[PDB]
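Technical annex B. To support the medicinal chemistry partners, we prepared a structural model of the target in complex with calcium ion, based solely on the information shown next.
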Amino acid sequence: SNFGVDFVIHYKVPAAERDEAEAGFVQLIRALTTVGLATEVRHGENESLLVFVKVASPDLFAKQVYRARLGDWLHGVRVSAPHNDIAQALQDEPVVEAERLRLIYLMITKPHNEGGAGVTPTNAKWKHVESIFPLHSHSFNKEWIKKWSSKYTLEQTDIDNIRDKFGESVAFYFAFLRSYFRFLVIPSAFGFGAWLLLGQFSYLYALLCGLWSVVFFEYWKKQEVDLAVQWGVRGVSSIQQSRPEFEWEHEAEDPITGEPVKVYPPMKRVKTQLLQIPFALACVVALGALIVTCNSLEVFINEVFLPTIFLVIGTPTISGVLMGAAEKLNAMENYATVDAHDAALIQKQFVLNFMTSYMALFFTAFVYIPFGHILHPFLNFWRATAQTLTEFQINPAAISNQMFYFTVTAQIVNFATEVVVPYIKQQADHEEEAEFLQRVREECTLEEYDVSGDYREMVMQFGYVAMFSVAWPLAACCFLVNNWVELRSDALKIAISSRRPIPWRTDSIGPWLTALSFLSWLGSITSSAIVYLCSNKAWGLLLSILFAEHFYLVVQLAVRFVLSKPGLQKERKERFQTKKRLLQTPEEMFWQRQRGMQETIEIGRRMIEQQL
Amino acid sequence: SNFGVDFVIHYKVPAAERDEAEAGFVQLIRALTTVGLATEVRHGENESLLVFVKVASPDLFAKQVYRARLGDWLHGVRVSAPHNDIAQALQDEPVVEAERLRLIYLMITKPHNEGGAGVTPTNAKWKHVESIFPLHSHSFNKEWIKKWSSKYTLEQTDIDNIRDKFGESVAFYFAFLRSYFRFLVIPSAFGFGAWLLLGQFSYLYALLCGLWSVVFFEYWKKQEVDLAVQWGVRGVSSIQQSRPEFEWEHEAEDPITGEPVKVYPPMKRVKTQLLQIPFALACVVALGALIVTCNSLEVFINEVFLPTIFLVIGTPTISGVLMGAAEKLNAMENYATVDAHDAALIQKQFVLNFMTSYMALFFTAFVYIPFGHILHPFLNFWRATAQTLTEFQINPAAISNQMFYFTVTAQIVNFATEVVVPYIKQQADHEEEAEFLQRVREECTLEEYDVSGDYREMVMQFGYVAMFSVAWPLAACCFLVNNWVELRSDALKIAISSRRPIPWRTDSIGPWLTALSFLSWLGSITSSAIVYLCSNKAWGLLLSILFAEHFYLVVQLAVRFVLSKPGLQKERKERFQTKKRLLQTPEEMFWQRQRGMQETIEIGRRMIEQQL
Ligand SMILES: [Ca+2]
Ligand SMILES: [Ca+2]
Ligand SMILES: [Ca+2]
Ligand SMILES: [Ca+2]
C-alpha cells in the first residue's frame, strides 16, 4: 500500500538553533544524493521534516547487491560465488525484501570509506537526525494476523515468510518460541500425570525435568544450525561489525593484515568494567532487604498473601528503573564491535532479572524452610509496631502456594501490561494522499521493537519450569496456554504497536544459549534440594545433590553422543559437487643387473628351483 | 647408507605349497611393475625372497605428488592450491622424506580404483606376503641419539627433524612427551615444597594438583592445534580412510553423492559389540579377587610388603595376555574406517590398563581404610591355613607406603623390561655388498613399532600424578627423572630395537584427549576423598567432594576463558591475502514533483521559512 517508499528519516529541528540546522540538512541531502538514492521531503509534526528515500537506478542497486554477495562469499558465509555477469543472479536466487532493506540501510549508514555516506545520528554532527526506519505494510499484516490466529500449529512456511519479510533475528526468535512451545507439551503432560497420581514433591519428577531440559536444549541447538544452514546465514557471527559510537585516542598499526584500526587500552576499559560488581552487590542487598520485609509482613498476617501480590505488582517499576540504569552504565564503558556490546548488555539484563525474579522463591525455599530464626527479629519488629499502633510459627510448605501465586497471578499481569496497556495508550500539497502522510506521522512516534525482552521473558519462563516446577507440577499446564497466547500476542505487538525493525542478520540467538545451560544446571540441583527439604539428617541432602547433578551430567553426555549421529549433509554434497566441478659403484652397478621385468621373473624362478 | 632403496617386501614361501606361491609372486610383480616402480629381488632367510623397490621415473612421481597435494587441497587440508605447472611446486615447498615414503606406501597399498595396485597381505589372496616396510639409516641414528643424549632441553627444531624424517604421529608423541615433561616441573617443585613444610595429606595440595592438571590439559590442547597448523596437517581427521579388512554382503547406493559403498547392518555389529560388558565384568571380578587375596596375604604378615612387590612383578604377564585377548576380540567385530577401528581398541586398552593399575590403590584407600571388615574372612582363612600348615588390626595409613612401592619399585621394573630385556635379546651374487643384505635380513625379523603403548604409559603416569600424588608428594620428583630418561629411552627403542614405522599423518594424538580429561576429573574427586579419609562424621566427606569438584569445574571454565584470547592468526592472514588476490496515479504522479536535487533544497528552505 506504500508509495514504493524504502526508508524514512525524521530530522527534527529546534527553535533557537534553526540557523545551525539548515546547513546540516543541506549537507545530509547532498551526501545522500551522491550515493544515488531518490529522495523527497514532506512536512512532519512538531518541528519535523519527513524524508522518504528509495533506490533510484536499478543498475547501481544490482552492482551493490553483487558486491555485498561477493563480500559475504569471501568471509565463508557462502559456498558458491556468483559469476561476473548480472543476468541470472537475481533470477535463480531473487533478492528478498529483507535483504534489499538491509542493503539500503547499510548503504545509508556506512561511511564513505566503504561506499556509503555516514549519517549515524550519534557519532558525527547529525544531532538533528532522530531515527531512520522502514515502513510497514498493513495489507500484509491484516492477512498475517488472521492467518496465524485462525490455525493451531505453525508450519515451516509460516516462519519462512517472516524470515523473508521481517528480517532474520525476528524469524529466529519466532522459530525458537515455536520449538519451545512444542517441547513444553511433554513436561506439561507428565506433570499432569504426576500431580494427581504421584503424591507431592516426587523425586522422579525432578530427574525427568532435568532430562527434558537437556533434551530440549540439545535438540534446539541442532535445529539452530539446521535453520542457519537452510537460510544461508551460517557463520555470520564471525563477521565483526564495527560500531559508530566507539571512541579512541590514536590509531595503532596492525602487523599482520594491517589497515587503520582504532584501539583502546584494555586497562582503562577494565577500570570502569569492574564497577559492575559493587553496583550489583549494592542493588541485590536492597532488593533482598525489600523481599525480607515483604515476606515478614506476609508471615505476620498468619498471626493476625497480600504482600506477595503487592510485591509482584510493584516489581516491574523497580526492575525497569534498574534495567535503565544498567543500560546507561553499559554506555559509560566502550566496546569496539557491536557483537561484544550486545553480548555484554544481555549478561547484565539476565543477572538483574534473575535476581529480581527467582530470589523471592529462593528466600522461601532455601532459607525460611531450613531455619526460620532469621525472620524472628523481623517478626518481633512487626509485632512491636502493631502493638505501638494502638508464638512460634513453622510453615509446613509455603513454596506450593508461592509458586502458584508467582505463576498464575504473574502471567496475567505480564500479559495485561504487554497487550492491554499499549492498546489503551493507542487511543490517546495536501493532495489526495494525506491518509498515507497521517499514517507515516503516526508511525514515527512509536517505539523501536527489540527482541531482547521477548527472549528474556521466555528464557526466564524456561528457568521457572526448570528449577521450580517440582513444587507445582501444574506450572507447565498454565505455561503451555500462556505460550500459545504469546505466540500471537508478540506478533500483534510487532504488527500494530511497534515500528518495523531494521532487518539484522544473525547466525545464533545470541548469548542466550549459555543462559539456558546455566539455568538448566542450577535447576538440576535446586529441584532435588527442594524435593528433599520439603519431603523431609543433613547427610542425605548432599547425596541427593550428588545423584541429581551427576545424573544431569551423564544425561547430557548421552544426549550429545546420540545427537552426534539435516543441512550439514546438503552442505557437504554441495561442497563435493563444486569440488568435482573445479576438478576439470654402489648404485649404478646394483640394479643394472635386473633392468627389465621379464628376466626378473626368470631369476626368481631360478632362485626358487635352486633353493629346494 | 642405503642403496637408494625405498620399500622392502618379504613374501615368505612354504614347503608343501611352493607351486601355489610362484603364481602369486608372478602376479604380485606384474601388478607392481605396471604402477611404475623399479624392483629387484634378493635371497632372504628361512624361505624368504626380499623385494626392494623405489620410484623409477621422477616424472610419474611428480604427477603422483601433485595429485596427492590436489586431493589434500579439495578436502580443506590446504588453503593454497598449486598451479598446473610442475616447476616450482617441489622448489618453494620441497617434498620431505616422510611425505615421499607415505606416498610410495599409498601407491603400493591402494587398489586399482584409485591408482595403485592392492597388495594388502590380509584381505586378498596375498597370504604369502609378510610385511612391507621401509629401511632405517644408521648414519642419521648414530648422530641423533648422541645429539639428544648430549643436551638437556629439546628445542623445536629437534622435534621438527623427527617430523621431517620419521613421520607425523611419532613427532606428535614426542612433542606431547616433551611438553608433559616440561609441565611436570611445577607439581614436582610444589610437592617438594609441601612434603617437608606442609604436614601430611594437605588439603591445599589436592586443589593445586587439580588446577595444574586443568592448566596443562588446556595448554596442551592449544599447542596441539598450533603444531597442527604449523606442520600443515590440520583437519586430516576429517578424512575417513578406508580399511582393507572390512567385510560386507552387498552394496547400497548412496542417495546424496552416490558412489559404490559397502555397508554392514548396525544391528549385527551391535550384537557382537555388546559382548564387551560381560567380558569386562568377568575379567575385573577375577582381577579383583586376585588383588583381594594379595592384600590379605600382605596384611596377614603384619601379624607374623612382599605380596605387593610380587603382584607388581607378575602383573605384566596377565596384562599382556588380557590385552592380546582384547585385541583379538576387536577383530571379531568389524569397523569400516580405520579411525573408528583405532579409536575402539584404545578404549578397551585404556579400560583394561586402568583397572589393572589403579585398582590396587583403590581397594586400599577407599575400601580397607573406611571399613576393613571385608578383609576379615580372608584374614581368618589365612590364619586357619597357617594353623593347619603344622587380633584386630587397624591400618593407620597404608596408602603412603603403597604409593611409594607402586611408583619407585614399578618404574625400575618397567624401564628394565622396556630397555634391558630387548637389549639382552638383541644378542641372541655374494658381491661386495653382503653387509647391507645381512643388515636387511636382521632388520625384517624385528617387531613393528606402535605409538599406542607409549601413549598409554604416559597417560597412566599422568593419572597416577592426578589422583594419587596427594598420598606421596615426592611422586612427581621421581616421575620427572623417569620422564627425562624415557625421552631418550623411547628414541633408542625406535632407533635400534624396532623397524622404521610407516609415516601416517594425524591431526590429533587420537582419543587420548578424552582419557586425560576423564582421569583429571576423577582425580579431582579421589584426591579430596583420600585427604579426608586419611586426615580424619560422613557429612563432611560429601561437602569436601562438592568443593573439590566444583572448584575443578570453575577452574576449567576460567582457564578456557583465559586461553580463548599462534598459527590461527597466520592462517587468517593467509586467507585474507588469498581473498585479496582473488578479488582482482499514486507512483508516477508523486515524486515527479521533485525530480532533481537542486529544487528539493529550495522546497525544504521554503517549508522551513513558512513554518515559523
Ligand atoms: Ca507475556
Ligand atoms: Ca513477550
Ligand atoms: Ca618406561
Ligand atoms: Ca615407554
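Notes passed to the chemistry partners:
Chain B has two domains: 7-135, 143-569.
Residues B 414-415, 418, 457, 486 surround calcium ion (ligand 3) (CB under 6 Å).
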